[PDB]
Amino acid sequence: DILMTQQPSSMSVSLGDTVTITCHASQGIRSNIGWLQQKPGKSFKGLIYLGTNLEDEVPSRFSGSGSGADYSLTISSLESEDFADYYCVQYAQFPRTFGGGTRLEIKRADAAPTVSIFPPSSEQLTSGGASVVCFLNNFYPKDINVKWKIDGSERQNGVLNSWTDQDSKDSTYSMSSTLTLTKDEYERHNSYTCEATHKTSTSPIVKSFNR
Amino acid sequence: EVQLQQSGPELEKPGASVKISCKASGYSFTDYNMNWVKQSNGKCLEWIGNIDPYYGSTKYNQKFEDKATLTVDKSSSTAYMQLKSLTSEDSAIYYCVRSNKYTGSVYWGQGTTLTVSSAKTTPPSVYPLAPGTGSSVTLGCLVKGYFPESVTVTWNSGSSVHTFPALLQSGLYTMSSSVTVPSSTWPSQTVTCSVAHPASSTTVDKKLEP
Ligand SMILES: CCP(=O)(O)OCc1ccc([N+](=O)[O-])cc1
Structure with a gap:
């Protein structure tokens, strides 16, 4: 099973920050990676698919990057709705596996x-x-x-x-x-x-x- | 408008089975795979499996091979996941997740909570928390030994309350609630927590005594 290590697991941040979440895969996943948000008391929303493509209704302040085995999600000027949980998901191999998540909390x-x-x-x-x-x-x-x-x-x-x-x-x-x-x-x-x-x-x- | 509407919360006894539905609309049902994801202990997400509704063919995570059975009903645009021989370890939130067969782009359903337990429905014991000086005073209510979740705690019917998540003491729930009031207001006037437990039809007032 491909392990996905996600860093950091929680971070206290502020409005207007630039925040980067990393996802390290135990082997090359050829950009077959998604990023997901779960806001508090809600279900999930896809943010990015295939590494770098924004899902629908995702504002431009979100971007994804990386390749081979090393990927990241950057939120430029963090806004109030961005205080949430974030997860990566690998789809290069079965089973799909997830990162352990990142909670963005209010500093x-x-x-x-x-x-x-x-x-x-x-x-x-x-x-x-x-x-x-x-x-x-x-x-x-x-x-x-x-x-x-x-x-x-x-x-x-x-x-x-x-x-x-x-x-x-x-x-x-x-x-x-x-x-x-x-x-x-x-x-x-x-x-x-x-x-x-x-x-x-x-x-x-x-x-x-x-x- | 893409909608994935799942069935409602589930409560079951160990060894029993449950069937969760995921009603899809607003797209061509056979064109997308349907995945099922488990979320437990908050942070732990696991891919259970997928089904291509066009072939009806299924792929499973090893770990869920005989736990889960994914089917569709292509005629009512509905995906199902059947979980069998349920254990305590099966209590979680389950999501159906539509994925694009070419891009892995995703849309998620609202999720379905399952709770597996041997417990029969049990009303709570509600104990006042009064202290054994300062201009405000904190009191509380300990809501002990109930099943299933959940309960509502309200203080004099009506800000300054903390409600702490329930925990599972030996097959049964316990949660506490705190309230901070003016010391001029208590003990001199009445402070009560009311604890409503739908499942057992109980409503019970406990006055906080000094
Ligand atoms: C290769 C196309 P696919 O296999 O149809 O989708 C990949 C996929 C599956 C599940 C999730 N998820 O989050 O549960 C994300 C992405």
Whole structure:
């Protein structure tokens, strides 16, 4: 199977930028390569076919180039609609194979997360479960590392993290971290801590409560 | 106007089968190949196969040889993809994709979501998230142990809400929702999350208590 390596896998960019996405094939594909866009919450649209030919309704700021095994898509002066996912697809051989994609995300200023910790509700404790929840809200850039601490000592098992997509109003990210225990296990310990590491602060942001 | 109109979302039990249709219009149906593409874990696209509707002849990715069966009905201009002995690993989005037989120029259908699971329909447990100082306060609702997707979370019926994608804890979904309000407003007035789950016909209000 022809492998298609696509670079970069994500990039934060700005309006008016010139952006280049590369697609490297594990053998020469003789320009039998397409580029595809998927905008958020939509299906796909063909951009370029056979290396360098624009599909219908594709503006001139998009161009494709390359040959043999090395190909690229350039977006000249990036516009607002161009904040999307991009994929190459090889059709020199069966099976057709795809690159792993490139997400173009909106560059903006850094923002520290607003972090909130929540003890289990009474009602869930009734069920025998104990979910401690931590929201980390409205931060940029997207990279954030979370640690849970029980009485000042870490736990990694039973943690579930969900990230938002880039926010439609301030271009930030948010995520939740949930630590799920049994009541039994939960009742044993007193202090519960959610610990976030992020570029906006050289020390961790810690949120904690006491049972 | 080229249209490729696919059938609707699918939910099935493991070992079962599903048949997805792709209704084509606005062109000569036999003149273009029809491909099927799988998208799973967001970023992973795979070519399942194609069918030349003129010959009815089919080509398959090795990986999908006995999973998928592509046919057309040349008379209703419809392509089908049949997926059999379904597993958890089959849950994905499936697209039909018309390609130009000479150029590889493409037009894509809207996609069809398939979810394969052993779970029977199950209403959510909804737990308030109140804190254990500052001019606003964040609260939340943990929406736990439901199936299938999806649910709607609304806060006092009505901006400042984050809704986090659901995750699959042991055959069953969990998602949380946060809201930020003025501290002057809570606990002094009522804050409620309402969780609607169509599939189980449930609507349930939980008041946030301090
Ligand atoms: C050689 C002409 P073809 O084999 O009819 O099309 C090539 C082709 C097939 C599928 C995709 N796709 O994105 O799924 C893109 C391009």
